[PDB]
Amino acid sequence: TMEEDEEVLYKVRAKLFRFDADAKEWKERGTGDCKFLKNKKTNKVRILMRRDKTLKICANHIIAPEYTLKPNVGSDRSWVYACTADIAEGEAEAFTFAIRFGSKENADKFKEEFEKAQEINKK
Amino acid sequence: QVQFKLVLVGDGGTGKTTFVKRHLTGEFEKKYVATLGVEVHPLVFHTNRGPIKFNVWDTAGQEKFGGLRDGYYIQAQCAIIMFDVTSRVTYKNVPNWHRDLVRVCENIPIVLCGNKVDIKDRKVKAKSIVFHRKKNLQYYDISAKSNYNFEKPFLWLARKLIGDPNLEFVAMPALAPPEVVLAAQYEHDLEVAQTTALPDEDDDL
Amino acid sequence: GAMEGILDFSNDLDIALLDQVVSTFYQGSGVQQKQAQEILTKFQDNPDAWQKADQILQFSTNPQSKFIALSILDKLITRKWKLLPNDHRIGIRNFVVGMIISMCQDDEVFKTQKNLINKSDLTLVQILKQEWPQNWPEFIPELIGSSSSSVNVCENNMIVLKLLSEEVFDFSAEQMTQAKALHLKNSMSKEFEQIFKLCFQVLEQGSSSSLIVATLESLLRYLHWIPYRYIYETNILELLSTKFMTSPDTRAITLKCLTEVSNLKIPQDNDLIKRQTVLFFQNTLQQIATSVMPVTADLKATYANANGNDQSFLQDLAMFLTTYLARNRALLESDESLRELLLNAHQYLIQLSKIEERELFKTTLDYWHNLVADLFYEPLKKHIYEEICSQLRLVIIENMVRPEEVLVVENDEGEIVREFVKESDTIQLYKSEREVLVYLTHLNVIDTEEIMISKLARQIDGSEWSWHNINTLSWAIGSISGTMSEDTEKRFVVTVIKDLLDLCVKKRGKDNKAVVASDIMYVVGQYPRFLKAHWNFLRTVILKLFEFMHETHEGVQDMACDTFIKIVQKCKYHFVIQQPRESEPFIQTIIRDIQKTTADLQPQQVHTFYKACGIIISEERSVAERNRLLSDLMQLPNMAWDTIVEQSTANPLLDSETVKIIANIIKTNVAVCTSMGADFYPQLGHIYYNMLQLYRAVSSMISAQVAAEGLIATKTPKVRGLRTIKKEILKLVETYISKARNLDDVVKVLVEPLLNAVLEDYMNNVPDARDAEVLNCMTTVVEKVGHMIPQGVILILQSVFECTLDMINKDFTEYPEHRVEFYKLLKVINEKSFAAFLELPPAAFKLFVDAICWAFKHNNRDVEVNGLQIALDLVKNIERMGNVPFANEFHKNYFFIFVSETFFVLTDSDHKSGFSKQALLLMKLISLVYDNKISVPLYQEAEVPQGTSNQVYLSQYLANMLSNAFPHLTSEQIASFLSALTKQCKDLVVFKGTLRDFLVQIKEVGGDPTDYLFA
Ligand SMILES: Nc1nc2c(ncn2[C@@H]2O[C@H](COP(=O)(O)OP(=O)(O)NP(=O)(O)O)[C@@H](O)[C@H]2O)c(=O)[nH]1
Ligand SMILES: *[C@H](CC(=O)OC(C)C)n1cnc(-c2cc(OC)cc(C(F)(F)F)c2)n1
Ligand SMILES: [Cl-]
Ligand SMILES: [Cl-]
Ligand SMILES: [Cl-]
Ligand SMILES: [Mg+2]
């Protein structure tokens, strides 16, 4: 499973989307627990998210210091950001993600923790 | 790792392709683009008995787009028969799909699925769904839209095919992801993403 | 690519190439497979591809290639058989028969190419449907003769006969005309004596071979239709119930045969037959006990192990036992010597009922309901089953599924959490279980109390304590409410509550408390009779629910709200009167503390709380007192409203917090209006005029935002929040008007300001800013007072008709909600205020007719059904007018448009769900001409001779229409169809049969025109 060597810094239910630039539309990639995981040997913090029931990975990438969380025009409980290397489906690939939460409170908490993890990764 | 041919059949518009797509990519396709003949998709699940691969033959339900029809069923090792609980005609046609299927595939595990249970005005009442009993089919209420029971058909089939009643889906290994940054990168592509509204903003998540 | 060669028919077919393409399709992957699939589909669909069939069958080295060759032939046989030259029909028959003969003779091919042989057999059967018996009278005799020559041939002949029986009796209804199905059923019936004789001979001299299995599979099909004498006057029941139950190879199919035998049409005054029916059951159960498993066996364990075919066998045994006993158990109930058989059979069912398999449990539970419902009524029967019923009580109580009211559930980490979604698929199961347990409790209330009370004992002492055990028990206790006497219930409920309160004290941690909380709330909500008798306890329950409204466990909190309203719906009278030894009706106390009580609830939970208070207040029938209670209840939302109305009118952009406050105020009014209905009027009057002013102001903000930011503005949180305000205002007005009892005040006071505020705003917004809820509100307005506001109804049509039509008439998908609400509005206007359509200008009326026909081309049932109903209602509306110029012009302009449009959706195969209502509309239209209810000629002066009747012209028009739309039909087919259809236009059932026959004939060539004489 490859998560026993990591501390869970933060966990929250979320729906993750990926932007399809060709279709010009957002498409759902998964709904489940989104976790911030800090490796005990490298101190590096990643996002790992798995779908309910199938437990398949729908996000797996470092919370890079250069990423920035931006609002979506349709929502006060979501963030959109560009990710250069996600390995959820195998080979490293660039995506524009959107992650939406149950409330604005949850979205704001996520940004707060997202940015904490970014500072952790720079150290 | 060995794979199993799964054939998916049922009336046009019952949600066969949408169901498979949900499993392949996690998306929910709102549009109805009718399948032409068959679309074949590999689908892997991770279990406590190792990976299981389904080769999903998602067939056309519209008669005018039926293609090879029962020709698709040759050497199928399992099947899903789909109907729409908001459309009584689609349940009425279940015995026709079953007939055509078992004539080619005489002894395979088959799940009957009543899709679209998210829709409030249900037309095929729970009490009415009995066709599976005398034919030894498993039955599930499902919704590809809300994901209600969406994993159940595949979990049941995997149990029958691998021959292990206590087979469970398990969490796939999560490899360490890489570090990256191309110095000359300009994506105004983010601004298009930001200004395209996310779908279903009234949903719980 | 090289693969496309097979599509060039000018050249000779490269069989090697074809086999490569087929193999690439079935055994390949990715792009190669996809390309191969397209090529093969194109090949199959070539209308001369069948001429290659024999060549492929002769030379191919690929079984799948030959399967595809047979599918091509099947397509030809089923659709174009009679288009063929006669020598081509003979050639095709000959090489299909020969291929089958050939494949059966070679043992290796017979063994390993079963798919191809089965496909060949079905193809032969398609030819028989066309050719037999009239052009093939010796098929059955020669099949029988051929059977003795070889075991392989005999076996295959059973497959052919099975397929023929299926096609003729089980699947003919949709695929053949009534006349053709009767012809083939009669033909099979006439030669069945010989078929059965062969079948019986094989079964007599064979044990458990593949030939025997095949013969039994064919027997299963015959049992659907054959006369009972073939089963009861031969020795076949002995063979099925003894010999064929012993070998597992034949056991599966024999059990299903015996299940179908239990459904035969059979004399019920015949002692000899009754004994045969008893004997086969006796034999069958004896073979089970001696060859499979004893009655004591753990079938739960066996099913769970899922060895070989055990699950399917246990399922089929369940079906056999339930089917037989539901029909025949009375045969076993009087004779002392049959008592052990009766009970052993039921004991097997008891054991089957312990299996963990939902769908199987439902099957057995259906049987138990049949049993206990009979024991509830039938003298002197229940005592026979007392031991079975006692075991059944235990099974049901231990397998109770979660009621919809229980909102907590255990997650994968062992934590008790609020459910993410409703368990929609267990609602019916719970109801079925409760039905059975209720009957079981009436049958023995003492046994039931004892089982429950002692199970509860073992939870307290800790011996069987578990969430699962306390849960199923609590759910069972709640589900039997109503079965006991008030006095026994009193003592029972008291004991239960005592014990559950003990558990709550003893079991610590929030997961334990959440579970026991859920269970006590469920139980107390299920016993309102008790609550009504015990005020002090009722008061204490409600006050405790109020404490739970402060719980941080979201599941408990939410269930507390649902339980409060559930209790209030039943006990409201006790909240409205002043109880002995209280200083005020409890409703006063509830209202006075409403701010404290609901402080931690989410808005929607708050609205539910207010809705419950509305239920109580509507019990007060003194109007002065009722209105004061209503006033007191709405104090908080009215004070918030008043300050917002002073702000808004002081100076209009509403920030997001103010928009949320407003929406929740209106939602609170909606909640209270829903429960109070007609009694809500004084509160509506307090806010009405300012509310419509707010609607206008919010509308300007939305419009302003779309103007400054573009259509994307409508996706933003601010604009979505503004539209929520408009939607809830419309919902409140709709909700009130739908329940109003003073319709004069609705018209004099409510309607004019409403139309003024909503109609022009709808009309003059861009499509994406129009609320479909406006149409919904207008439907209720027309429905309730439409007859009193003829000019208002005209104003509604003027404002929404043409602009909404233009939104929805470019495709079937855009603006789904507007689409649905649009046709609901037209339907009610057409029913209630038809004059509104009479006032339309001719061009707009034409659009209305267009709109209706557009509706019945939808596959969306909401739209389609209303479209067909509107059309039917419109015809009735025109007819009522009698012989007047508008009716005459209507028919001249539109009668044939309706006839042809209805025919189009009848015959196009994409609107099968609408068949019944399409047929009804068509029959009405045709009957109008055949009762001479159209006063003017439907034709032009030039078309046809002066004085020609409308009946003669209608036939002429339809024959022409059908002739051009279906050119493969003969003139006689069309003339015969119309003759029949026209003559049957007063008899819907026959009329529909004739339509179904026509739908069969258009799928093929050379349909027999005499079929339309069926009667
Ligand atoms: N509400 C709801 N809609 C669904 C669900 N599943 C599918 N749909 C919708 O139903 C329509 C048909 O879906 P689709 O998968 O194309 O059906 P299909 O059975 O593959 N049709 P075909 O046999 O012609 O290829 C789509 O608009 C889709 O969004 C569901 O669970 N709920
Ligand atoms: C146990 C449940 C509990 O307290 O859990 C919370 C979350 C801490 N418990 C103790 N007392 C009750 C109780 C008592 C009542 O008195 C008449 C009434 C109820 C009610 F459910 F019916 F409201 C509950 N529950
Ligand atoms: Cl084959
Ligand atoms: Cl009451
Ligand atoms: Cl003719
Ligand atoms: Mg499809």
Short mmCIF file of N, CA and C in Angstrom, two decimals, chain B residues 5 36-40 57 62-64 67-75 86-87 89 92-93 95-96 99 103-107 117 121-123 125-127 129-130 132-134 136-139 141 146 148-149 156 160 165 195-197 201-202 204, chain C residues 25-27 33 37 40-41 44 64 67-68 71 75 79 115 118-119 122 163 166-167 171 174-175 256 259-260 263 304-306 309 311-312 315-316 319 357 359 362-363 366 420-426 428 432 712 715 720 861-862 910 912-913 1003:
data_model
loop_
_atom_site.label_atom_id
_atom_site.label_comp_id
_atom_site.label_asym_id
_atom_site.label_seq_id
_atom_site.Cartn_x
_atom_site.Cartn_y
_atom_site.Cartn_z
N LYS B 5 -13.22 -11.51 -20.04
CA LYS B 5 -14.10 -10.79 -20.95
C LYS B 5 -15.45 -10.60 -20.27
N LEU B 36 -21.71 2.81 -30.86
CA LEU B 36 -21.79 2.23 -32.20
C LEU B 36 -21.12 0.85 -32.19
N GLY B 37 -21.94 -0.20 -32.17
CA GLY B 37 -21.45 -1.58 -32.13
C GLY B 37 -20.99 -1.98 -30.74
N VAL B 38 -19.69 -1.84 -30.50
CA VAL B 38 -19.10 -2.12 -29.20
C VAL B 38 -17.89 -1.21 -28.96
N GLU B 39 -17.65 -0.87 -27.70
CA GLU B 39 -16.40 -0.25 -27.27
C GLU B 39 -15.78 -1.16 -26.22
N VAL B 40 -14.50 -1.46 -26.40
CA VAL B 40 -13.78 -2.37 -25.53
C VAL B 40 -12.82 -1.58 -24.66
N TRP B 57 -16.52 -5.24 -22.75
CA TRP B 57 -17.14 -5.06 -24.06
C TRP B 57 -18.47 -4.39 -23.85
N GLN B 62 -29.14 0.45 -28.82
CA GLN B 62 -30.04 0.85 -29.90
C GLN B 62 -29.95 -0.16 -31.04
N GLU B 63 -31.10 -0.66 -31.48
CA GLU B 63 -31.13 -1.68 -32.54
C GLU B 63 -30.41 -1.22 -33.80
N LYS B 64 -30.60 0.05 -34.19
CA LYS B 64 -29.98 0.54 -35.42
C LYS B 64 -28.45 0.67 -35.32
N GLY B 67 -24.67 -3.41 -34.47
CA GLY B 67 -23.47 -4.02 -35.05
C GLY B 67 -23.57 -5.53 -35.14
N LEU B 68 -22.56 -6.21 -34.62
CA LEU B 68 -22.51 -7.67 -34.65
C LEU B 68 -23.49 -8.33 -33.66
N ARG B 69 -24.09 -7.53 -32.78
CA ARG B 69 -25.10 -8.02 -31.82
C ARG B 69 -24.55 -9.19 -30.99
N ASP B 70 -25.16 -10.37 -31.07
CA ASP B 70 -24.72 -11.50 -30.24
C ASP B 70 -23.32 -12.01 -30.61
N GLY B 71 -22.81 -11.61 -31.77
CA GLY B 71 -21.42 -11.86 -32.12
C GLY B 71 -20.43 -11.34 -31.08
N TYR B 72 -20.82 -10.31 -30.33
CA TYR B 72 -19.96 -9.74 -29.30
C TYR B 72 -19.81 -10.66 -28.09
N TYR B 73 -20.77 -11.56 -27.90
CA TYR B 73 -20.87 -12.33 -26.67
C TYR B 73 -19.97 -13.55 -26.67
N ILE B 74 -19.44 -13.90 -27.84
CA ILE B 74 -18.64 -15.09 -28.00
C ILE B 74 -17.46 -15.03 -27.02
N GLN B 75 -17.33 -16.10 -26.23
CA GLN B 75 -16.24 -16.26 -25.26
C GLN B 75 -16.25 -15.27 -24.09
N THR B 86 -36.26 4.16 -14.17
CA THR B 86 -37.21 5.19 -14.60
C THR B 86 -37.88 4.85 -15.94
N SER B 87 -37.54 3.70 -16.54
CA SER B 87 -38.12 3.33 -17.84
C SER B 87 -38.54 1.86 -17.86
N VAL B 89 -40.09 0.05 -20.02
CA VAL B 89 -39.79 -0.68 -21.25
C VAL B 89 -38.42 -1.37 -21.16
N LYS B 92 -38.82 -4.51 -19.13
CA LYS B 92 -39.55 -5.46 -19.98
C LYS B 92 -38.63 -6.14 -20.99
N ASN B 93 -37.61 -5.42 -21.47
CA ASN B 93 -36.66 -5.98 -22.44
C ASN B 93 -35.53 -6.83 -21.86
N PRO B 95 -35.55 -9.80 -20.30
CA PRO B 95 -35.58 -11.20 -20.72
C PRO B 95 -35.11 -11.41 -22.17
N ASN B 96 -35.28 -10.41 -23.02
CA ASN B 96 -34.78 -10.48 -24.41
C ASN B 96 -33.25 -10.43 -24.45
N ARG B 99 -31.99 -13.75 -22.91
CA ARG B 99 -32.14 -14.80 -23.93
C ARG B 99 -30.99 -14.79 -24.92
N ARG B 103 -27.88 -17.84 -24.77
CA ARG B 103 -27.77 -18.70 -25.96
C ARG B 103 -26.34 -18.83 -26.46
N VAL B 104 -25.54 -17.78 -26.27
CA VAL B 104 -24.13 -17.82 -26.64
C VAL B 104 -23.25 -18.18 -25.43
N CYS B 105 -23.62 -17.71 -24.24
CA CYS B 105 -22.82 -17.91 -23.03
C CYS B 105 -23.63 -18.69 -22.00
N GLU B 106 -23.47 -20.01 -22.04
CA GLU B 106 -24.40 -20.90 -21.36
C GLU B 106 -24.20 -20.98 -19.85
N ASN B 107 -22.97 -20.81 -19.38
CA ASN B 107 -22.71 -20.88 -17.95
C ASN B 107 -21.71 -19.84 -17.45
N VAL B 117 -31.22 5.08 -9.98
CA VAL B 117 -32.02 5.12 -8.75
C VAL B 117 -31.92 6.49 -8.05
N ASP B 121 -38.56 10.18 -9.37
CA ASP B 121 -39.74 9.51 -9.91
C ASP B 121 -39.38 8.14 -10.51
N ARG B 122 -39.18 7.16 -9.63
CA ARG B 122 -38.85 5.80 -10.03
C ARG B 122 -40.09 5.09 -10.59
N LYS B 123 -39.92 4.37 -11.70
CA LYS B 123 -41.05 3.72 -12.38
C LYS B 123 -41.06 2.19 -12.23
N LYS B 125 -40.75 -0.41 -9.80
CA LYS B 125 -40.76 -0.60 -8.35
C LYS B 125 -39.89 -1.77 -7.91
N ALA B 126 -39.27 -1.63 -6.74
CA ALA B 126 -38.42 -2.67 -6.17
C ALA B 126 -39.12 -4.02 -6.15
N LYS B 127 -40.36 -4.02 -5.67
CA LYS B 127 -41.19 -5.22 -5.59
C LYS B 127 -41.36 -5.92 -6.94
N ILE B 129 -39.10 -6.21 -9.35
CA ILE B 129 -37.87 -6.75 -9.93
C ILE B 129 -37.65 -8.17 -9.41
N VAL B 130 -38.04 -9.16 -10.22
CA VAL B 130 -37.96 -10.58 -9.83
C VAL B 130 -37.36 -11.50 -10.91
N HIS B 132 -34.49 -12.01 -12.12
CA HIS B 132 -33.22 -12.63 -11.77
C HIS B 132 -33.30 -13.89 -10.94
N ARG B 133 -34.43 -14.13 -10.27
CA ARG B 133 -34.52 -15.22 -9.30
C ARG B 133 -34.43 -16.59 -9.96
N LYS B 134 -35.32 -16.86 -10.91
CA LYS B 134 -35.30 -18.13 -11.63
C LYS B 134 -34.10 -18.29 -12.56
N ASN B 136 -30.92 -17.16 -11.77
CA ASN B 136 -29.71 -17.16 -10.95
C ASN B 136 -28.80 -15.96 -11.20
N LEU B 137 -29.39 -14.82 -11.54
CA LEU B 137 -28.62 -13.59 -11.71
C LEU B 137 -28.54 -12.88 -10.37
N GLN B 138 -27.40 -12.24 -10.09
CA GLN B 138 -27.32 -11.32 -8.96
C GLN B 138 -28.06 -10.03 -9.35
N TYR B 139 -28.67 -9.34 -8.39
CA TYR B 139 -29.32 -8.05 -8.68
C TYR B 139 -28.82 -6.93 -7.78
N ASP B 141 -29.67 -2.52 -7.29
CA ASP B 141 -30.00 -1.12 -7.56
C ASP B 141 -28.67 -0.38 -7.66
N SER B 146 -24.84 9.03 -8.76
CA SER B 146 -24.55 9.19 -7.34
C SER B 146 -23.53 8.17 -6.82
N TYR B 148 -24.19 5.13 -6.17
CA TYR B 148 -24.88 4.17 -5.33
C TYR B 148 -24.64 2.74 -5.82
N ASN B 149 -24.02 1.91 -4.96
CA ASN B 149 -23.66 0.52 -5.28
C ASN B 149 -22.79 0.31 -6.53
N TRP B 156 -18.83 -8.59 -7.03
CA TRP B 156 -19.51 -9.88 -7.09
C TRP B 156 -18.96 -10.75 -8.20
N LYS B 160 -17.02 -14.49 -8.00
CA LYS B 160 -17.42 -15.67 -8.76
C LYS B 160 -16.30 -16.15 -9.68
N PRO B 165 -15.19 -16.24 -2.07
CA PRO B 165 -16.26 -15.43 -1.49
C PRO B 165 -15.81 -14.27 -0.61
N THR B 195 -12.20 30.27 -15.20
CA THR B 195 -13.40 30.95 -15.69
C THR B 195 -14.41 29.99 -16.32
N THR B 196 -14.12 28.69 -16.27
CA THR B 196 -15.10 27.67 -16.63
C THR B 196 -15.68 27.11 -15.34
N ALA B 197 -16.99 27.31 -15.15
CA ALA B 197 -17.67 26.90 -13.92
C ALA B 197 -17.60 25.39 -13.71
N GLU B 201 -22.85 22.54 -8.83
CA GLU B 201 -22.47 23.32 -7.65
C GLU B 201 -23.49 23.18 -6.51
N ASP B 202 -24.68 22.66 -6.80
CA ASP B 202 -25.66 22.37 -5.75
C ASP B 202 -25.42 21.02 -5.04
N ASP B 204 -23.73 17.96 -2.77
CA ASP B 204 -23.16 17.91 -1.41
C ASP B 204 -21.65 18.11 -1.43
N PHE C 25 -10.17 -8.87 -34.40
CA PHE C 25 -11.24 -8.35 -33.57
C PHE C 25 -11.39 -9.07 -32.22
N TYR C 26 -11.50 -10.39 -32.23
CA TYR C 26 -11.76 -11.13 -30.98
C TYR C 26 -10.53 -11.30 -30.09
N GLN C 27 -9.36 -11.47 -30.70
CA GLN C 27 -8.12 -11.74 -29.95
C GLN C 27 -7.16 -10.55 -29.87
N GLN C 33 -7.98 -3.76 -33.01
CA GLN C 33 -9.28 -4.35 -32.70
C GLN C 33 -10.41 -3.45 -33.17
N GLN C 37 -13.25 -4.24 -35.93
CA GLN C 37 -14.67 -4.20 -35.57
C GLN C 37 -15.50 -3.41 -36.59
N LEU C 40 -15.68 -5.41 -39.96
CA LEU C 40 -16.62 -6.53 -39.82
C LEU C 40 -18.08 -6.09 -39.80
N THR C 41 -18.37 -5.00 -39.10
CA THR C 41 -19.72 -4.45 -39.06
C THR C 41 -20.15 -4.02 -40.46
N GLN C 44 -20.76 -7.24 -42.47
CA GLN C 44 -22.03 -7.83 -42.07
C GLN C 44 -23.22 -7.10 -42.70
N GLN C 64 -15.47 -18.28 -35.28
CA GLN C 64 -16.11 -16.97 -35.14
C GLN C 64 -16.50 -16.39 -36.50
N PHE C 67 -19.69 -18.12 -37.29
CA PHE C 67 -20.75 -17.54 -36.46
C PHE C 67 -21.26 -16.27 -37.13
N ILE C 68 -20.34 -15.41 -37.55
CA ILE C 68 -20.69 -14.15 -38.21
C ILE C 68 -21.39 -14.39 -39.55
N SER C 71 -24.98 -15.14 -38.52
CA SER C 71 -25.69 -13.90 -38.16
C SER C 71 -26.15 -13.15 -39.41
N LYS C 75 -30.14 -12.52 -40.25
CA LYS C 75 -30.64 -11.20 -40.65
C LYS C 75 -31.44 -11.29 -41.96
N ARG C 79 -35.71 -10.88 -42.07
CA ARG C 79 -36.21 -9.64 -42.69
C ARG C 79 -36.54 -9.72 -44.18
N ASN C 115 -20.71 -23.57 -29.53
CA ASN C 115 -21.19 -22.23 -29.88
C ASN C 115 -21.70 -22.17 -31.31
N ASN C 118 -24.96 -24.43 -31.69
CA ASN C 118 -26.11 -23.72 -31.14
C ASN C 118 -26.57 -22.59 -32.06
N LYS C 119 -25.61 -21.85 -32.62
CA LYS C 119 -25.92 -20.77 -33.56
C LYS C 119 -26.57 -21.32 -34.83
N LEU C 122 -30.22 -22.31 -34.02
CA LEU C 122 -31.10 -21.13 -33.98
C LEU C 122 -31.42 -20.65 -35.40
N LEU C 163 -35.21 -24.61 -28.68
CA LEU C 163 -35.21 -23.28 -29.32
C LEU C 163 -36.53 -22.98 -30.03
N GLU C 166 -39.19 -22.18 -27.50
CA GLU C 166 -38.94 -20.81 -27.01
C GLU C 166 -39.44 -19.75 -27.99
N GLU C 167 -39.09 -19.91 -29.26
CA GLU C 167 -39.46 -18.92 -30.27
C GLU C 167 -40.97 -18.88 -30.50
N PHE C 171 -41.40 -16.25 -26.73
CA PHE C 171 -40.91 -14.99 -27.32
C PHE C 171 -41.61 -14.57 -28.60
N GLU C 174 -43.90 -10.35 -29.14
CA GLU C 174 -43.37 -9.12 -29.74
C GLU C 174 -42.89 -9.29 -31.18
N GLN C 175 -42.65 -10.53 -31.61
CA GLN C 175 -41.90 -10.79 -32.84
C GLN C 175 -42.73 -11.34 -34.01
N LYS C 256 -35.88 -27.34 -11.54
CA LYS C 256 -36.58 -26.27 -12.27
C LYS C 256 -37.80 -26.79 -13.04
N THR C 259 -40.38 -27.32 -10.44
CA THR C 259 -40.92 -26.01 -10.11
C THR C 259 -41.99 -25.60 -11.11
N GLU C 260 -41.71 -25.77 -12.40
CA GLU C 260 -42.73 -25.46 -13.41
C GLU C 260 -43.92 -26.41 -13.35
N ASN C 263 -46.66 -25.36 -11.25
CA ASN C 263 -47.48 -24.28 -11.82
C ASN C 263 -48.42 -24.71 -12.96
N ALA C 304 -22.29 -19.63 1.83
CA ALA C 304 -21.12 -18.77 2.01
C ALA C 304 -19.84 -19.37 1.42
N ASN C 305 -19.67 -20.69 1.57
CA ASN C 305 -18.52 -21.39 0.98
C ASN C 305 -18.54 -21.36 -0.54
N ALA C 306 -19.74 -21.32 -1.13
CA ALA C 306 -19.89 -21.12 -2.57
C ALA C 306 -19.12 -22.15 -3.41
N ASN C 309 -21.62 -25.46 -7.69
CA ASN C 309 -22.90 -24.86 -8.05
C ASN C 309 -23.87 -24.79 -6.87
N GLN C 311 -24.60 -22.40 -4.66
CA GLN C 311 -25.44 -21.21 -4.51
C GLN C 311 -26.65 -21.28 -5.42
N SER C 312 -26.45 -21.65 -6.69
CA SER C 312 -27.55 -21.76 -7.64
C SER C 312 -28.52 -22.88 -7.23
N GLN C 315 -30.56 -21.60 -4.27
CA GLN C 315 -31.54 -20.69 -4.85
C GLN C 315 -32.70 -21.45 -5.50
N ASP C 316 -32.38 -22.44 -6.33
CA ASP C 316 -33.43 -23.20 -7.04
C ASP C 316 -34.28 -24.04 -6.08
N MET C 319 -36.76 -21.65 -4.63
CA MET C 319 -37.84 -21.39 -5.60
C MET C 319 -38.79 -22.58 -5.69
N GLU C 357 -27.76 -13.43 1.80
CA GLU C 357 -27.93 -13.12 0.38
C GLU C 357 -29.26 -12.39 0.21
N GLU C 359 -31.15 -10.93 -2.05
CA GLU C 359 -32.18 -11.24 -3.04
C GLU C 359 -32.84 -12.58 -2.75
N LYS C 362 -35.24 -12.06 0.14
CA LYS C 362 -36.49 -11.47 -0.34
C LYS C 362 -37.43 -12.54 -0.89
N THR C 363 -36.88 -13.53 -1.57
CA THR C 363 -37.69 -14.61 -2.14
C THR C 363 -38.34 -15.44 -1.04
N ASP C 366 -41.04 -13.30 0.90
CA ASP C 366 -42.29 -13.31 0.13
C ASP C 366 -43.13 -14.53 0.47
N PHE C 420 -23.71 9.08 4.56
CA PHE C 420 -23.46 10.00 3.45
C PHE C 420 -24.71 10.17 2.60
N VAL C 421 -25.43 9.07 2.37
CA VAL C 421 -26.61 9.07 1.51
C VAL C 421 -27.69 8.15 2.08
N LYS C 422 -28.87 8.19 1.48
CA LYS C 422 -29.96 7.30 1.89
C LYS C 422 -29.69 5.90 1.37
N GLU C 423 -30.04 4.89 2.17
CA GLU C 423 -30.02 3.50 1.73
C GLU C 423 -31.32 3.22 0.98
N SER C 424 -31.45 3.82 -0.20
CA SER C 424 -32.67 3.74 -0.99
C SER C 424 -33.11 2.30 -1.26
N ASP C 425 -32.16 1.38 -1.40
CA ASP C 425 -32.48 0.01 -1.82
C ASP C 425 -32.92 -0.96 -0.72
N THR C 426 -32.97 -0.51 0.53
CA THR C 426 -33.43 -1.34 1.65
C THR C 426 -34.78 -0.87 2.24
N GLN C 428 -37.85 -0.97 0.80
CA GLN C 428 -38.85 -2.00 0.56
C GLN C 428 -38.60 -3.24 1.43
N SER C 432 -41.27 -5.04 4.03
CA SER C 432 -41.61 -6.46 3.91
C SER C 432 -41.35 -7.23 5.21
N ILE C 712 -21.74 34.08 -17.85
CA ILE C 712 -20.99 33.40 -16.80
C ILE C 712 -21.39 33.88 -15.39
N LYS C 715 -23.38 31.60 -13.13
CA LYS C 715 -22.71 30.53 -12.40
C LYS C 715 -22.16 30.98 -11.05
N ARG C 720 -26.24 33.05 -8.09
CA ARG C 720 -26.96 31.84 -7.66
C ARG C 720 -27.74 32.11 -6.36
N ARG C 861 -40.04 10.92 -20.69
CA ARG C 861 -41.43 10.54 -20.38
C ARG C 861 -42.26 11.68 -19.81
N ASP C 862 -41.64 12.56 -19.04
CA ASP C 862 -42.35 13.72 -18.51
C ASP C 862 -43.01 14.48 -19.66
N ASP C 910 -38.55 4.38 -31.92
CA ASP C 910 -37.81 5.14 -30.92
C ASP C 910 -38.73 5.73 -29.85
N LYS C 912 -41.30 3.66 -28.03
CA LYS C 912 -42.09 2.50 -27.64
C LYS C 912 -42.84 2.68 -26.31
N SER C 913 -42.27 3.46 -25.40
CA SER C 913 -42.94 3.77 -24.12
C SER C 913 -44.30 4.46 -24.26
N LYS C 1003 -41.27 -4.66 -40.37
CA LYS C 1003 -39.88 -5.11 -40.17
C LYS C 1003 -39.41 -6.17 -41.16
#
